């Protein structure tokens, strides 16, 4: 598998829909 593709791209989707939405959905 890949080790690092998008450094900032993902950080946006993750920091915008994976920082609270994802966490809370543990």
Curated annotation (Swiss-Prot):
Transmembrane segments: none annotated. Detected in gizzard, liver, small intestine, large intestine, cloaca, bursa of Fabricius, gall bladder, lung, trachea, kidney, testis and bone marrow. It is found in: Secreted. It comes from the Eukaryota. Binds bacterial lipopolysaccharide (LPS). Has potent antimicrobial activity against Gram-positive and Gram-negative bacteria (in vitro). Has hemolytic activity (in vitro). May play a role in the innate immune response. Belongs to the cathelicidin family. This is Cathelicidin-1. It comes from Gallus gallus (Chicken). The chain holds residues 123 to 148 of 148 of the full protein.
């Amino acid at each position: 598998r890949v080790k690092r593709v998008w450094p900032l791209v993902i950080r946006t989707v993750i920091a915008g829909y994976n920082l609270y939405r994802a966490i809370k959905k543990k």
